[PDB]
RNA sequence: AAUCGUACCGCAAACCAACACAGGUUAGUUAUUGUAAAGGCUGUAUAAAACCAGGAUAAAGGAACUCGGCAAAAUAGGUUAUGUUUUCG
C-alpha cells in the first residue's frame, strides 16, 4: 500500500534516506496553501515508519532482485526503477533507495557491479558515469563477475590442496575434525509439530 | 539559568565520558515524557531541563527530517507516538519553556541539591503557567506599540485549520 | 532530638517554654568498638568505632545571646500562587 | 616472585607424613606420642576423629 | 515402568517458580525428578535418567549395548576407553539444555516483535481517527 | 541388589597468600567470514585550580637532545632482473 509524498509525484520509501513524508490528511490540498498558513503539520502527513517497516524492506529486494535474474546484461538503477515499476506499479519512488538495497545485495554476494577502468585514481573518484549492476541465480562465496568468480575460486582451491599436504608432512591432519553436537531437544520436536500444522492448514 | 560551558554545546560533563553521558540524558528524557514529573540531583535536572525544550522543538516541527532525528533519542515506540500527537498539539502557541525546575532542598544520605522537573501546561501541574498567548488590554499602550513594531502579533488562540484551509476546502466541495 | 526531649522535661516540672535559654551543653565518651585493619607489607593499623554521650540543660532567664535569624517564606505551589496573574502591560510605558 | 604460598594442601600428603598409622611404625614416633600424652594435649595426632 | 518422566511443572524448569527442595539450585540429571513440584510417590519410576530437556525421540537410545561392541580387549586402553564414554554421556546433558534455551529464545523474540507490531498499528488507527474529527468539524 | 560421595563456592567476596588482596590455581566443553547465539555482570554528589599519571593533535626546523636516538614516531607486507659472501644448506 505505497502512499504518495505531498507533491503527489512519487511514493516514500522506507529508509533512513528519505526526508519527505507522507501525505495523509482527508482532502487533497496542495503544499503551498497549509505549509506557510500556520496550522500543524501532523495533521496533514505522516512523518513515522509504518508497522510493517522492517518487512516491506524485504519485500522490496525480492522484487529487485527477481527483475535482475530476469534481465540478460548488466544494466543502469534508472532502468532497474523503471522495469519494477511497470511491473507491478508505482511502488517504488527514487534511484537512491534502489541503491541502498544494492548495496546489501552487494556485501552478501546476492549481486555484483561492473566497474570501469580508469588510467588513474583521481580520473576513478571523479567519473560520472553511471554503474552496471547484475544478480547470481544462487548466492555464492567470492566476489565480482561470474568471470572473476572463476578466478577466485582457482586460487582458492590451489591454496586448499596446498594447506592440506603442507599439515599432512609435518604430521598434522590433513582435513580438521570436530564433535557434533546435539542440537534437537524438546522445544525443537514441538517446532516440527507447529510446522506441520501449519503447512497442513 | 542553565550554566554555560567551554565544551561542544556548552553541556554539562554529569561525571561522566561523552558516550555514556549521552546513553543516561536519552534515557531520562523519554521518562519525562511518560510521566511528566521527575526528581533528581540538581545537575541531571539542569541539563534535562535545557534537553527537554529542544526535544519538544522536535514534536512541533511535524517533519520527517524532525522525526528521524527524535527517533535516535526516545527510547520507547509508545513515548514518541505520544511527542508528535499530544504533545505537538499542547505547546502550538507557546514559544518556549515547556519545561520548569523548582529547587526541592538536600538529600539525606550524601546531602546533594535535589530539584523538580515538571512540564508547564496540564492537570496536575504543580503551579498555574501563565497563558501562551498574552491577552492586551485594547486601550493600552502595549498595543499601539506592537502595531508599530509587530503588525503580526497574536493577542488569542489560533485555531487548528485557519480560514484559509476552511476556504479552500469550501470552495472545493 | 536532644533538644526537644529536654523541653519536654521541663514542662513536665512547670517551666515557661518561651523563656527557656540553653545554657551548658558538653559531650562525653562512650565505650569504643576496637578493631585492626592490614596495611602492606604486613603491618596492621587500628580500626576503630566511637561512642559518645550528650547532655543539654535548659534554664530560665539565663544570660543569652542577641543573635537572631531572619525568617522568609518558601516556595508557593498549588492555589495559593497567583504569578499568572501579573499585567505586563505597565512595563511598556514611560 | 611473591612468597608466602608454601603450604599446598593435599589430604593424601597429610595422612600419610603426620598420620598416626605413621607415628606408630617408629620408636622415635612412639617416644613423640608418650611426650604428648605427658603434657596432655587433647589432640595426639591431625589425624584423630570421632 | 515408563522410559521417560512426562509430567513436569514448567515454570520451576524456566526458573521462575521454585522446587520442592529450595536448597537445590542447579539440579543434577538424577535430582530433578525429586525437585519437581508435581513429585508423587504412586507415580512409577522410570527405567532411564533423563533431564526435562531431552526429547521424546530419546527412548529409543541404548548406549551400553554399543558401547559393550566397541570395548577394547586390552584392560589399559579399556580403562580410558570407558572413561571418554562416561564423559560423552554427561555432556549431551547439556547440549540438550543449550538447545532448549536457544529455541525458547527466538520463540520469545517472535512474539515480542509481533505484540510491537500490533500496538503501533491500534494507536496509528486512533489518531487517523481524531485527524478526520477534526476536519470534519471545521466543515 | 551391600557400602561411601551427591547441598553451596570453585579465574574466586567461600581455595593458597594475616584481608571482600590488581598476585597464584588443573582438565573438559560452547556462539563468531569483516564478527559473535546462550548465559553473566553493574558506579556517593559536582566542576571552567596548580601539579602528577595514561592518551590525542600540532606551524617551521629534524638528533641541534642526551653518558647513550632512553622514550616516541616511521609503507611496515609480497615478487624481482643483476651482484657479493659461503662450511654450498
Ligand atoms: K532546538
Ligand atoms: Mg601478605
Ligand atoms: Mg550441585
Ligand atoms: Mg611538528
Ligand atoms: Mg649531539
Known amino acids: ?201 | 539559568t542553565v550554566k554555560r560551558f567551554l565544551r561542544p554545546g556548552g553541556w554539562n560533563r554529569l561525571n561522566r565520558p561523552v558516550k555514556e553521558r549521552l546513553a543516561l540524558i536519552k534515557n531520562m528524557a523519554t521518562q519525562l515524557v511518560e510521566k511528566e514529573r521527575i526528581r533528581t540531583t540538581l545537575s541531571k535536572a539542569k541539563n534535562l531541563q535545557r534537553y527537554g525544550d529542544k526535544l519538544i522543538t522536535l514534536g512541533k516541527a511535524g517533519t520527517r527530517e524532525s522525526w528521524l532525528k527524535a527517533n535516535d533519542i526516545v527510547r520507547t515506540d509508545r513515548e514518541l507516538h505520544k511527542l508528535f500527537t499530544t504533545l505537538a498539539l499542547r505547546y502550538k502557541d507557546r514559544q518556549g519553556g515547556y519545561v520548569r525546575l523548582i529547587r526541592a532542598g538536600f538529600r539525606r544520605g550524601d546531602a546533594a541539591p535535589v530539584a523538580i522537573v515538571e512540564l508547564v501546561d496540564r492537570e496536575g501541574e504543580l503551579r498555574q503557567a501563565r497563558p501562551a498567548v498574552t491577552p492586551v488590554p485594547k486601550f493600552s499602550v502595549m498595543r499601539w506599540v506592537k502595531q508599530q513594531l509587530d503588525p503580526k502579533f497574536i493577542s488569542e488562540p489560533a485555531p487548528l485549520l485557519p480560514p484559509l484551509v476552511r476556504d479552500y476546502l469550501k470552495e472545493q466541495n | 532530638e536532644g533538644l526537644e526531649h529536654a523541653r519536654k522535661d521541663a514542662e513536665e516540672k512547670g517551666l515557661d517554654p518561651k523563656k527557656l535559654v540553653v545554657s551548658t551543653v558538653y559531650t562525653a565518651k562512650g565505650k569504643y568498638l576496637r578493631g585492626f585493619q592490614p596495611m602492606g607489607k604486613g603491618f596492621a593499623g587500628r580500626k576503630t568505632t566511637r561512642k559518645t554521650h550528650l547532655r543539654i540543660v535548659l534554664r530560665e532567664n539565663a544570660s543569652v545571646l542577641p543573635f537572631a535569624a531572619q525568617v522568609v517564606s518558601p516556595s508557593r505551589v498549588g492555589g495559593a500562587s497567583q504569578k499568572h496573574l501579573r499585567d505586563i502591560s505597565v512595563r511598556y510605558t514611560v | 616472585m611473591k612468597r608466602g604460598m608454601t603450604y599446598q594442601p593435599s589430604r593424601k600428603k597429610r595422612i600419610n607424613k603426620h598420620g598416626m598409622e605413621k607415628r606408630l611404625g617408629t620408636e622415635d614416633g612412639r617416644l613423640t606420642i608418650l611426650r604428648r600424652l605427658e603434657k596432655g594435649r587433647w589432640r595426639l595426632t591431625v589425624d584423630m576423629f570421632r | 515402568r515408563p522410559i521417560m518422566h512426562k509430567n513436569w511443572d514448567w515454570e520451576f524448569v524456566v526458573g521462575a517458580k521454585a522446587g520442592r527442595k529450595p536448597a537445590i539450585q542447579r539440579p543434577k540429571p538424577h535430582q530433578w525428578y525429586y525437585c519437581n513440584p508435581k513429585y508423587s510417590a504412586e507415580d512409577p519410576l522410570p527405567t532411564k535418567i533423563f533431564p526435562p530437556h531431552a526429547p521424546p525421540t530419546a527412548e529409543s537410545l541404548d548406549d551400553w549395548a554399543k558401547f559393550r561392541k566397541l570395548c577394547p580387549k586390552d584392560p589399559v586402553e579399556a580403562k580410558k576407553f570407558r572413561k571418554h564414554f562416561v564423559r560423552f554421556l554427561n555432556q549431551r546433558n547439556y547440549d540438550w539444555r543449550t538447545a532448549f534455551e536457544r529455541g525458547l529464545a527466538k520463540e520469545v523474540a517472535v512474539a515480542k516483535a509481533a505484540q510491537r507490531a500490533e500496538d503501533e498499528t491500534k494507536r496509528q488507527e486512533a489518531w487517523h481517527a481524531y485527524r478526520t474529527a477534526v476536519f470534519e468539524s471545521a466543515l
Do not use: C
Not at chain 1, 532497474?80 to 507491478?88: A, P, R
Open chain 1, 1 to 201: 500500500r505505497p502512499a504518495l509524498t505531498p507533491s503527489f509525484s512519487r511514493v516514500s520509501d522506507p529508509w533512513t534516506g528519505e526526508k519527505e513524508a507522507k501525505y495523509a490528511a482527508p482532502y487533497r490540498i496542495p503544499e503551498e496553501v497549509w505549509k506557510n498558513s500556520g496550522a500543524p503539520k501532523i495533521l496533514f502527513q505522516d512523518p513515522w515508519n509504518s508497522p510493517d517497516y522492517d518487512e516491506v524492506r524485504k519485500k522490496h529486494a525480492v522484487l529487485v532482485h527477481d527483475y535482475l535474474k530476469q534481465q540478460s546484461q548488466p544494466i543502469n538503477v534508472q532502468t532497474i526503477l523503471e522495469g519494477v515499476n511497470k511491473t507491478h506499479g508505482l511502488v517504488l519512488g527514487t534511484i537512491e533507495y534502489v541503491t541502498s538495497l544494492l548495496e546489501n545485495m552487494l556485501w552478501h554476494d546476492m549481486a555484483y557491479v561492473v566497474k570501469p577502468v580508469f588510467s588513474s585514481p583521481r580520473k576513478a573518484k571523479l567519473s560520472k558515469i553511471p554503474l552496471l549492476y547484475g544478480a547470481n541465480k544462487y548466492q555464492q562465496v567470492f566476489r565480482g563477475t561470474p568471470k572473476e568468480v572463476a578466478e577466485r575460486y582457482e586460487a582458492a582451491r590451489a591454496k586448499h590442496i596446498k594447506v592440506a599436504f603442507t599439515r599432512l608432512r609435518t604430521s598434522k591432519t590433513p582435513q580438521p575434525f570436530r564433535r557434533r553436537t546435539d542440537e534437537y531437544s524438546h522445544v525443537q520436536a514441538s517446532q516440527s509439530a507447529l510446522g506441520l500444522a501449519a503447512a497442513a492448514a
